[PDB]
Design a binder for this molecule. Structure first.
Ligand SMILES: *[C@@H]1O[C@H](CO)[C@@H](O)[C@H](O)[C@H]1NC(C)=O
Ligand SMILES: *[C@@H]1O[C@H](CO)[C@@H](O)[C@H](O)[C@H]1NC(C)=O
Lengths: 48, 49
């Protein structure tokens, strides 16, 4: 939830250090049209 | 030919229809519907605006 995102050609990688990854907070905040995980299952993201 | 059939009809938004697959997570797949792992069925969806 930011004012501006990067352009696709200047795509601005950033890292996420010590914090708890709880995707539950975005349930009424945003609606995701695509959510595809590779090498991991979406139902195991809470146990990892 | 099938020996038993069920329906399970409801209404969600268009962005959440992807969450009605077996191994999905999200607001609907976590707190609302939650299909099982060995489903053996078909999932039908269509816009109804
Ligand atoms: C969540 O979304 C609903 C629907 O727009 C809104 O009424 C509510 O204020 C939002 N926040 C919370 C904490 O429910
Ligand atoms: C997202 O950005 C909006 C800016 O309009 C802000 O009002 C809101 O508090 C931010 N956070 C959430 C969870 O919506």
């Amino acid at each position: 939830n930011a004012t501006t995102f990067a352009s696709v050609y200047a795509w601005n990688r950033k890292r996420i250090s010590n914090c708890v990854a709880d995707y539950s907070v975005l349930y009424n905040s945003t609606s995701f049209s695509t959510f595809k995980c590779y090498g991991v299952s979406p139902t195991k993201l809470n146990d990892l | 030919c099938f020996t038993n059939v069920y329906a399970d009809s409801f209404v969600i938004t268009g962005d959440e229809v992807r969450q009605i697959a077996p191994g999905q997570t999200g607001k609907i797949a976590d707190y609302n519907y939650k299909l099982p792992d060995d489903f053996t069925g078909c999932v039908i969806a269509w816009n109804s605006k």
